[PDB]
Amino acid sequence: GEELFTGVVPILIELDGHVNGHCFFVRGEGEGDATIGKLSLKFIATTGKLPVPWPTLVTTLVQCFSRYPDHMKRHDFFKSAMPEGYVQERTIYFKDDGTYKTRAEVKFEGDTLVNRIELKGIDFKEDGNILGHKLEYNFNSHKVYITADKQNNGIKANFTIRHNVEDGSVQLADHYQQNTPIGDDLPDDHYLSTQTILSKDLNEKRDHMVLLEYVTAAGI
Amino acid sequence: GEELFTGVVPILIELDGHVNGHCFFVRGEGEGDATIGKLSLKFIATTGKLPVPWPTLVTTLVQCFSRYPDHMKRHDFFKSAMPEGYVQERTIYFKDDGTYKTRAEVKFEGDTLVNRIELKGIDFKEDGNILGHKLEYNFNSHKVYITADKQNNGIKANFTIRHNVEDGSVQLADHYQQNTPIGDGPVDLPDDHYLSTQTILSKDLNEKRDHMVLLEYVTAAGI
Ligand SMILES: [Cu+2]
């Protein structure tokens, strides 16, 4: 499993999104390097202007690329669910606002690691921070708290994303997560420490997101 | 199973459609009466103007509501799955044109019978009859040939839809179908028969969204 992440691996991400009657498709390409815990990705909305802000889709759009330092390798479930992969499901509750529900399969298809997702968004207020496009084009650092789910031969994860709002206020987004292996390890409690920059290609006419991200595992 | 169709039952239909990079959502509501084999439905495209003609979605958008006459009740698989429901999968090949692949779950959610579908459309020619919106706003009668698929505890079905085209020609659409029960309970596996179908497509004159009003009569025969 780990053997497949020694060095740079090409990435493909695909998202099916349906939110309050509005539909979108997002394709992402780039590279991941799990030895340094770095992702470099460009995402394009093939269906035109997104009906939701790009930052709300960051956590949905490969943890497999988190850097697990040598003393924590035995706690890296994401790797070793390779090459068959794992199913990542989440419910994301936006405080005072609407909810995303997601399902995804992360796996190898040849040399490329692929993340295919379906996203359903419900009960979002018109003129809220999400449908109103009131979220700043940035992202903050978080701790992703991971625990083992022995009964589903996998893991649960809990976190709160902090979305900055043009207002000066903050939009919270409580993430509840589950991962189960597709094919035939289970960690003690730890967390992933995350950092992310969102930018734009200045020559790109389509609605898009350039993303650089660093993630490393800690807490043992 | 059959017990649940004695009266008028409210219907909900939902379609996820992805065709040649386009994407759309269709919500449908109305009523079905299986005693007379009648559907009355209104469909709305919540995502704007559909990238494909409404008639191409008709077969994808509740055969449990077919009328099975008393002498054929033991051959009605669709109702015997219920209320737990069945999975309806199809491949639809359009002659000289691109194909749909569909998957759907038909089941009860409370009193409402619900049909939730995913549709993938591939290899459709731009300025063909489908992407070019060249199909007349109507629908024809067909025979849906049903056979038993004992090995999947369900049924296969085959038929060809005839879509009239504005030029006077016809666009054929070969349907290949499979149904399997969602539940573990027993179901009726039928001897070969067919469903006879008739359908009218109309518009609500007060509806500004892209939509389809549909009235349909279907009865089972051929024993
Ligand atoms: Cu979709």
DSSP string over B57-76? GTTT--GGGSB--GGGGGG-
User: What are the structural domain ranges in chain A?
Assistant: 1-220
- Angle formed at CA A121 by CA A128 and CA A138, multiple of 5 degrees: 55
Buried b (16+ CB within 10 A) or exposed e, A130-140: bbeebbbeebe
Preferred mutation among B25, B43, B47, B210 to probe A, highest tally of A CBs within 10 A: B47
Sign of CA dihedral A123, A128, A134, A139: negative
- Angle formed at CA A97 by CA A157 and CA B27, multiple of 5 degrees: 100
Backbone dihedral angles phi then psi of residue B210, each to the nearest 5 degrees: -70, 130
Q: Shortest Cα distance from B82 to chain A (angstroms)?
A: 26
CATH domain B1-223 topology? Green Fluorescent Protein (2.40.155)
CB contact under 8 A, B46 and A21: yes
Which residue carries 């995913």 as its tokens? B118
CA distance B93 to B190: 26
Cα B48 to middle of ligand 1, angstroms? 14
CB contact under 8 A, B24 and A23: yes
Do A115 and A62 contact (CB within 8 A), yes or no? yes
Q: Which tokens belong to A122?
A: 């419900």
Sequence-ordered list of residues with C-beta below 8 angstroms from that of A84, at least 6 positions apart, any chain = A107, A181, A182, A183, A184
Do B119 and B90 contact (CB within 8 A), yes or no? no
CA distance A208 to A200: 7
Q: Shortest Cα distance from A179 to chain B (angstroms)?
A: 24
**Strands (DSSP E) along chain B, which ranges?**
8-19, 22-33, 38-45, 86-94, 99-109, 112-122, 142-149, 154-164, 170-181, 193-202, 211-221
Do A131 and A125 contact (CB within 8 A), yes or no? yes
CB contact under 8 A, B21 and A25: yes
Chain B residues lying within 8 Å of A25, measured CB to CB: 18, 21, 23
Do B190 and B177 contact (CB within 8 A), yes or no? no
What separation in angstroms does the CA of A198 have from each of A57, A162, A208?
12, 14, 10
The 8-class DSSP code of residue B135 comes to B
CA distance B142 to B161: 7
CATH domain A1-220 topology? Green Fluorescent Protein (2.40.155)
Chain B residues lying within 8 Å of A21, measured CB to CB: 25, 46-47
Sequence-ordered list of residues with C-beta below 8 angstroms from that of A162, at least 6 positions apart, any chain = A140, A142, A170, A171, A172, A173
Closest Cα partner for B218 from B144, B164, B130? B144
